[PDB]
Structure formats: structure tokens, C-alpha cells
Amino acid sequence: FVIRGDEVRQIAPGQTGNIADYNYKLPDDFTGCVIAWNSNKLDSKVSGN
Amino acid sequence: PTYGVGHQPYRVVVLSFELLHAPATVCGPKKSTNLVKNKCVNFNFNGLK
């Protein structure tokens, strides 16, 4: 998916916020990996997306 | 500080001994006793029973 760069800290076990509890929640006993990279060159519009 | 328990920093101290017959320089706190000779006794010399 695509989220705001600052909200990237909300994708983690034991976290709280807005995206964490309303859009995507990870379990406390979660195993795996998370990969996020900047994509302002690909998903940006001068008018606004 | 808002990370999960699995990502909070932990301070680690590792103690490595080299227990050997060499004359020990570090010893635990014990008490000495007067020397007794020429009879069946139970002795303890620098941890050697």
C-alpha cells in the first residue's frame, strides 16, 4: 500500500495512532519484516493526487 | 521510548572467568582461620576442598 512518510512509524507491533488502529494493525506477537522506501518520484502530482 | 519491548535497548554485561590452578588474584569474601597441623581435618585452600 501507500501511506505518508511520517506515518511509517505506526506500522509496528505494539504501536498506536490512526493508521495503526483504523487502517492496518499488526499483532503484538508478530514475526516478519517491513520494507518502506520513498516514492515521491512515482506517485506525486503537481495539482495533487 | 515508544518502541515495542522487542526493540527497546538492553544493557549487557558479560563476565568471563579463567578458573585455573594459577594463584588467584580475585577471590570471594570469606574468613581465614588458624592453621592446624598433624591431625585429620577438612581443609579449604583458595577454593580447593
Side-chain angles (χ1 to χ4, degrees), chain A residues 9 13 15, chain B residues 2-4:
Chain A
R9 55 161 271 290
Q15 280 274 18
Chain B
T2 184
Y3 276 13

Side-chain angles (χ1 to χ4, degrees), chain A residues 5-25:
Chain A
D6 54 6
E7 314 164 352
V8 73
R9 55 161 271 290
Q10 293 179 356
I11 301 185
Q15 280 274 18
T16 56
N18 164 281
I19 315 295
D21 58 356
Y22 293 10
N23 298 113
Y24 194 11
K25 188 94 180 43

Side-chain angles (χ1 to χ4, degrees), chain A residues 4-49:
Chain A
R4 188 172 302 179
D6 54 6
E7 314 164 352
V8 73
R9 55 161 271 290
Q10 293 179 356
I11 301 185
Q15 280 274 18
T16 56
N18 164 281
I19 315 295
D21 58 356
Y22 293 10
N23 298 113
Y24 194 11
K25 188 94 180 43
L26 295 180
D28 292 331
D29 49 355
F30 164 64
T31 174
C33 295
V34 62
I35 309 152
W37 65 99
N38 186 292
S39 175
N40 190 39
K41 190 260 179 183
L42 274 73
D43 301 331
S44 300
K45 296 178 186 178
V46 174
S47 61
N49 206 352

Side-chain angles (χ1 to χ4, degrees), chain B residues 19-36:
Chain B
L19 189 152
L20 195 64
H21 71 276
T25 74
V26 55
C27 275
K30 295 279 279 193
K31 302 296 305 292
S32 295
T33 309
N34 294 266
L35 186 59
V36 179

